[PDB]
């Protein structure tokens, strides 16, 4: 992971770029804290001309122990868009995780628990290993399990920020095909620190339905229902504890 206070992506869309452009003003995207900050679009270098990239805050900019989990979230990854060649490959990974079932599907996971280097939980696991909503579950709770303790006090950020994502998307202004939500914090945070985050990322597939078209459905509140669902099981059962 880099360490500088920004980091920059290249623009694989422009289906991507607008996004990023259009709700960098909006107070209920940015203002309620659900996407990263997003300072611009800016073109380097590449061969004989320019390419776009996008500028983004490091959301884990001075963490000292990363901990973080990527959850993909919907009912189905592709899109219209998808290729046909990569459609195959796109329905096995949705029906053999938890994708079409919950809405939400394991993603990766890194933990740093003092013995480096930090142990890494391949994405890949989700058609086996993680591929139902108790082993799912099982997995978020690891992402709380610091090695010394379980992180508790966490747990009501986590679905704080659920909730302001349902209640955004409860508006339906756009489906969202191949996101994630993205849970990240530092083991060496207080509560004060405010070291732990939760955003959603990856939009080169969304769509502005009062701009274009998209029949299919994303399933994403859904999704977003079944994660909040399985936060308050963990904080339950992290009462006792």
């Known amino acids: 992971h880099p360490d500088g206070q920004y980091l920059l992506k290249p623009c694989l869309s422009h289906r991507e770029r607008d996004f990023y452009l259009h709700i960098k003003d909006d107070k209920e995207w940015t203002g309620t804290g659900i996407i990263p900050k997003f300072y611009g679009v800016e073109l380097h270098e590449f061969g004989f001309g320019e390419l776009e990239f996008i500028r983004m805050e490091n959301l884990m900019y001075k963490y000292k122990r990363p901990f973080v989990l990527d959850l993909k979230i919907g009912t189905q990854t592709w899109d219209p868009e998808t290729a046909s060649s990569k459609m195959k490959k796109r329905l096995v990974v949705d029906s053999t995780s ?144």
Request: hydrophobic share 35%; charged share 30%.
């Open 98 to 241: 938890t994708t079409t079932s919950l809405g939400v599907r394991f993603s990766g996971m890194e933990r740093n628990i003092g013995e480096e280097k930090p142990i890494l939980y391949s994405r890949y696991l989700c058609t086996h290993e993680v591929n139902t909503r108790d082993s799912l579950k099982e997995y978020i709770k690891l992402f709380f399990n610091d090695g010394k303790k379980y992180r508790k006090e966490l747990v009501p950020y986590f679905i704080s920020q659920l909730d302001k994502m349902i209640e955004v998307m409860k508006k339906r202004e756009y489906k969202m095909f191949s996101s994630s939500v993205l849970f990240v914090y530092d083991s060496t945070t207080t509560l004060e620190d405010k070291k732990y985050n939760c955003k959603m990322i990856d939009f080169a597939h969304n769509w502005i339905l009062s701009e274009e078209e998209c029949t299919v459905e994303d399933g994403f509140l859904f999704g977003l229902n079944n994660l909040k669902s399985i936060l308050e099981d963990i904080e339950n059962e992290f009462k006792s504890l």
